[PDB]
Amino acid sequence: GPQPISRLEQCGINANDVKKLEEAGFHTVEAVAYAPKKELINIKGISEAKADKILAEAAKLVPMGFTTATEFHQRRSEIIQITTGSKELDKLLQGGIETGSITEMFGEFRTGKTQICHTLAVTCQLPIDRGGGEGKAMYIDTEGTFRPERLLAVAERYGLSGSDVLDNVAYARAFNTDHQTQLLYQASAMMVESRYALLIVDSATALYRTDYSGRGELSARQMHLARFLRMLLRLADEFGVAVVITNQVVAQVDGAAMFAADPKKPIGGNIIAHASTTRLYLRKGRGETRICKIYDSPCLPEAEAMFAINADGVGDAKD
Amino acid sequence: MDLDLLDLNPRIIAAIKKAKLKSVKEVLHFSGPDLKRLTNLSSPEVWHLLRTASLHLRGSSILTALQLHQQKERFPTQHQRLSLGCPVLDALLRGGLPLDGITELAGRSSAGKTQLALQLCLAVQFPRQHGGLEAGAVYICTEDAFPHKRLQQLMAQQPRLRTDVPGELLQKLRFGSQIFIEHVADVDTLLECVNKKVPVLLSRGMARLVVIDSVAAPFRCEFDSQASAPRARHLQSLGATLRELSSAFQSPVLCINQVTEAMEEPLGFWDERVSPALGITWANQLLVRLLADRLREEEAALGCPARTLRVLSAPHLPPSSCSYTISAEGVRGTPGTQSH
DNA sequence: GAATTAACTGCCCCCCCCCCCCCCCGTCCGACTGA
Ligand SMILES: Nc1ncnc2c1ncn2[C@@H]1O[C@H](COP(=O)(O)OP(=O)(O)OP(=O)(O)O)[C@@H](O)[C@H]1O
Ligand SMILES: Nc1ncnc2c1ncn2[C@@H]1O[C@H](COP(=O)(O)OP(=O)(O)OP(=O)(O)O)[C@@H](O)[C@H]1O
Ligand SMILES: [Ca+2]
Ligand SMILES: [Mg+2]
Ligand SMILES: [Mg+2]
């Protein structure tokens, strides 16, 4: 069972200090073993030497190796938020796009799902002071829709070297689901040699619509997608990178919908919804302006923002 | 080692020693014919041995239902409840989660399961008068990273949510240091975690609440439609272990589940578009089954999302429902919304 | 002419309510406007 606080004196502490810890709300070795150091030493008359001594006593007395919420937050508080190139989007996402998580953007047709990917592929190489991530970029393509001349425009907008940007972006093309999944082992091998800050898959579910067709092939398609997303999550957790993927849409041809403004939902079922962390929904706006809406997020409220696609990349709507 | 204190004859205990029987659990593991062939002795002495072993293991107190009803302090599991933090949700649940068995929470994505899990994790550290258990909690993430930012925001906003509790002891409560986080990636990893790490935390008394972020996530990435038997075996083992731990340490177990569509071409879901996953084998292991649902813009074209928390089945709760909203403070139920 | 074998089809019943617009293909002229 639990060891009472009346055991500390046999380990080398006097009654005064163990009592001082006792009336501070703590009543067992287990509670004080994981207690934060600053909260232990903020009490007046408590020296750091005896604090470290009693912490060592607890560590050799209490089974350690258990993560704690305060330690979890104070150990991984140096996350990086890459800027999207638009002030409105950065404000809406509260600083940009986080690392160590999967962010997906879904929408129809001429919405800006590829321009955003290009802009992120450029801006991820900026210094952390300027809002970047200070790393390379990986672009996995499934539709043959990669244009370096779009990256050149952003590199010129931000005053970066044109040739250097095109040297930091690794590129690969996928022709089926097996090749797309197999490329992840090569990605894992490559991420050890250098430091990467972004990984782009566009589009994640483009090939699954045609590789598996009909109700008969639904289960295998869903399991393959789940395994692919599990591999992506493992990569993101291990290397601390930002994974951005794009999705597609499908119509709702039944009478349940009534607002009649072309109802549409993302494809992939529940696996892609549960695997991804933050989901964005882009729709067409007047002229070249577009509207971005937060579809799902564990720590954000649903809202809306407006951006535009310009000659220099994704930016803010002109006046 | 323990049957020595039992009254007996030397012959039967000599036979037991020769047959390598250790404790009463070992002798109760075997049946009549097995014990008869192992001890090679007559049936009536086997019956006497079984009777004596059973009387040794249990059978001392004649516990009626008056002792369950009147003696509130003797049996906390039948009266004490874990409050959910909101009076409306507690009224819907008639007090909160039971202290024994497994409670399921199921629903589609972006419904608000993680927010409820975090609120329950924070609400367990209150004193017994305020609906808590004066202990910590264990969080097991099976799908993705833990949301530390939302937890910190909830901890900061905690004084605003708990309006009824006066705030002098709120600053004493160290919310961050009494929550433990674990990560798993496989079904076998989760089984090893629940077999080894969880009992260590519960026995020593750090925590009295277990939360699984997504029980269905590991099982949906390994077993196809043609491998139902191994999945059923694993689910039965996990449910048995969880129920045993919850009963032994009087700690509620909250499981978060996903859903699958009907795909209309039973189990009580006739006109429901979605049903809890993992089949009927997992559904047999639970005690109270909940369901959180969100009506999309088609029904949510009024300006704000519509969220309803529904009770599917429970041994002591009628099928009911309510409404709730998610804000910067936490999950709060809408007053005057419970359905009969 | 007939015993015998072979090939194509079939397995079924619930939704009766009704705010909802959204990103232009207007057809074009009056006047502004800066150059
Ligand atoms: N240099 C540019 N200047 C202005 N607008 C541009 C420029 N280049 C492309 N665009 C616009 O950006 C959009 C490109 O759409 P995009 O390729 O991002 O779509 P998508 O969501 O990837 O579509 P798909 O589903 O076909 O993959 C178009 O509407 C196009 O008019
Ligand atoms: N201030 C806020 N902070 C965080 N979330 C908020 C806020 N206001 C509203 N929300 C809503 O909270 C929801 C959080 O969803 P949540 O993470 O609980 O979904 P889930 O699918 O149950 O989770 P998980 O997949 O992790 O189990 C979002 O859909 C968002 O709209
Ligand atoms: Ca999610
Ligand atoms: Mg594209
Ligand atoms: Mg949630």
XYZ file of C-alpha atoms and ligand atoms in Angstrom, chain A residues 273-279 296 298, chain B residues 109-110 143-144, ligand 3:
14
model
C -11.625 12.329 -39.255
C -10.307 10.698 -36.074
C -6.653 10.529 -37.154
C -6.221 14.199 -38.073
C -6.005 16.861 -35.368
C -7.073 20.100 -37.092
C -9.376 20.236 -40.124
C -12.489 20.579 -36.109
C -9.249 20.155 -29.888
C -15.677 13.206 -34.416
C -15.852 16.782 -33.099
C -4.611 7.762 -31.215
C -2.592 11.006 -31.174
Ca -9.752 14.807 -34.217
